[PDB]
Request: fold
Amino acid sequence: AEVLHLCRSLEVGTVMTLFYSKKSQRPERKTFQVKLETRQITWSRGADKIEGSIDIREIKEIRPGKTSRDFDRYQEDPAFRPDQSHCFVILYGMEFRLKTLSLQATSEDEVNMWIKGLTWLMEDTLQAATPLQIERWLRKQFYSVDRNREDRISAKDLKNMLSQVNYRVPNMRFLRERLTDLSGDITYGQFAQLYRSLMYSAQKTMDLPFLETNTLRTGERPELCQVSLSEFQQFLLEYQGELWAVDRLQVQEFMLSFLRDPLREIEEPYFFLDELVTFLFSKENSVWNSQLDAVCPETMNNPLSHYWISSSANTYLTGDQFSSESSLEAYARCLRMGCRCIELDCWDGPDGMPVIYHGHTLTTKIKFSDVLHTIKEHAFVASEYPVILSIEDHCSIAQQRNMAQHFRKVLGDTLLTKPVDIAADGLPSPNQLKRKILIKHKKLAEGSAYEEVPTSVMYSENDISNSIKNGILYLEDPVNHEWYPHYFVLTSSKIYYSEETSSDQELHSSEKWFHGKLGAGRDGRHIAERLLTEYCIETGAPDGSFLVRESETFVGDYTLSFWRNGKVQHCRIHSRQPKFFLTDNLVFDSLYDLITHYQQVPLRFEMRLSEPVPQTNAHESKEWYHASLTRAQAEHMLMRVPRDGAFLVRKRNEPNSYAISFRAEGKIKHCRVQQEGQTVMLGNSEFDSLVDLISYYEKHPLYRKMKLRYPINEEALEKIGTAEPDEPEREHLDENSPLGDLLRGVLDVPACQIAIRPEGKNNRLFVFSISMPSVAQWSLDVAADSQEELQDWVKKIREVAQTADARLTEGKMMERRKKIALELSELVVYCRPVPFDEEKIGTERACYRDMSSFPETKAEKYVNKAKGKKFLQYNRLQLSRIYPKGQRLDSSNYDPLPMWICGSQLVALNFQTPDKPMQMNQALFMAGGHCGYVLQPSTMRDEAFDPFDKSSLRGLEPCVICIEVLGARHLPKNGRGIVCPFVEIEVAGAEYDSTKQKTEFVVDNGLNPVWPAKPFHFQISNPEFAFLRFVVYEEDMFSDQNFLAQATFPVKGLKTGYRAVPLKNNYSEDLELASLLIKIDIFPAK
Ligand SMILES: [Ca+2]
Reply:
């Protein structure tokens, strides 16, 4: 069909030029291909050596051109200059930040072919059929663990692969023994057949009212008995309630659509029992009614003040508000996900063009024309409804004319200049503002010059902006004395220092086969087999094994040994300064390559060595070890140190059990790790060696967010810099602080005296240590990286000591600020901020155009029993923007449900933060396919509704919902251990409906678990506004609740009967094959 030809042609491959993301790597030439078996894009180092490839499913957008970071980085040097019609970039990822791949071709036709083929492949693979998706998943999981396509995987490989997909295998020789190698141990067909057999057998305990009633359960393992068409014809009418099942033709079409098989297409379609059970979970059985995913033009004709428009704040950023970078990719992603309100913060630019960055903060600056271009490029790709640009300006006034001119010229007709209806008493409906962009700014008053009227912004409370001077200075480490970075802010009379912030953007010895020292002469000869012969008893070396290490009889050489025909030969490697070579063998530049070379050529005198062997006695030599150690001493050393995170390992009396003692929140915790032969485990998780365990946990969390960081030994305590030795000011809480939760201490400048230290500081040279003469034994040494900064900080601090506070009021009342320009202020026609007056609510003196802004703090004083009712009448006619308080330096969001129910529309969030409010915001907009606009229910638009009074609901029909979860399938992994999942259900809404109920937790099963029956009853008084949320938590060995997957749905558009619930991730991105099965019943008016 003129497309398969294109796909197969693309399968051939082509030679592209890759521009690496990292600056160090030079642009290079590679070979690219598309694999249609698993729908992958694969590039190879050479002709057929693949380097990792990517999945077509994750492709989020394809853009032709060179607008990417790598090209701009390399655009300077005139050696790899790109061309506007010979390069493109691929965007992929499942997070807010999208990874990019920058490619260059040789001709335009080649690029056109590639882009068209990839677009079509992505479109086809997106909406596939469940059996096809399962087949592709099997193919990927099989080949990925198969370096070649020979389709050969051993028993150990199958066991490990099963262990890697959240399913333990305690049944030795589990289930079946079809062949058991009685060359390919498990072919693809055998793999798929066994997969379906297991997925059916392990999930047979769930009892259904119709599946097992068809004279089934006789005992046949394959259960060839196929469900007839008529039984489905009746069932779909009985339980599911699909009226479409009345006609046989529609049912038959459904059968064919789900099946997608030609051989069975021509004879009375049927389902086998396994296929039926799999169909239960399929998206075709999804509880969410896909019919609602469209956008109804009827529900887009109300005044704009009613819709719960999306929003975001601090878009240019991509992380914490203090040191995160700024990029246009954030703007693109936010506009794509379905946002309609974004904020711009402008500052004076060196060349007359502003730069967008956070005021008085270490935020990387970006240009303005580039931001405008990105806005124009990604404005109406995901919708056709207006977007509002709120501008925060701090620039000059000539910069204001420049901004206005650039905006007009670039945006052309898309920018508003006239109002749709001057005489209209309400904001025009969204349909009237299709393909438009609104501009929001402080606006100029009816007078002249800078003017807002009150100017009395009396908040003026501590923050990153209203400070004497901020910056990043290092602090010493009492244990090992490393100058980690910290955040310093100089306030009027106090300073604040935060917790460490690490947030940012040999080979032969480390080799597994490298055993290190073994003995001295004869011991090495005999000990060599002592660590191998006793090891191979586990499984047995296939065609022998090998071991190599430093040679004993030959100093400066390595001895090579290998088991062969009941003999362990001894060899030597001649290391001559540098081309290492064996006896009468080709030279090799390194030992690592010397051994590897033998593993490629088929040395089968030529011996080919098998897989290497891991080592065990590697933890003993390390410092963090104690052969003998009792509890009391354990916690004594653990509490001796002043920092939290210290860890150590100790022996335990019963064999093969060790303990890890660590510190957290000023408390001791002990974790028991068991050992068995060639395995270790603190729980369901499995690790090869204790050294491997610590290394994995040295860079990954173990308990809560703590990370093993300080290895503790008597020497470390002896060299301890200071731990409250010989009253300090560590302090706690102090919530009302500039640094929100990041605060770690406080100090008062007036009582401090400053003395510079132009002396031999440890590896530092810019020090202005602070001393406390009032209380002896205090020295707050602070380092820096330049001479000028040290002087600037010191001078500012000294002024504080003799400041002699004389400011008129708290944080000043502001003064001549920007001299607002006419050009920039002329554009705004809607959404012009003004002060908030309570008396105007409900009167004839309030205009619909004006809005107001709340930093969640003056807002939390309106969402209450006394003010909720009055505040509700305000959002009916006017808008109201709510943004997070300045104290939140982690970008943490806030629960907006009270704000939404109260009627506020533009509830801005922080998209970069994957937290519960963001998930709720994403879920709420499902009604419309993320079009960005959702209409308010009819109940909230009545004169008697009250957000905090059940009886006020009047004549709304209540609802009673009965839920019973049967089981899960394909739960994602978390860390290394096997998840012990429990699914908790929650109803969210008003304060008088919110509730949560949790089930029990299954042990060591996450691939297909089923829970004991326990019907759940829920009651809702306001079905129109509610949210049903399933969260699959895991019960770790520390009795804590971690996050695996979530699924939130509005209650309005839900089906009945037996249903499947697809899962997602914390970022609201669909998972693959993960879902739940439930029985749901609704009893309206009962
Ligand atoms: Ca701002």
About this structure: The pocket of calcium ion is lined by residues 343, 345, 392 (CB under 6 Å). The domain at 625-719 is CATH 3.30.505.10 (SHC Adaptor Protein). The longest strand covers residues 959-969.
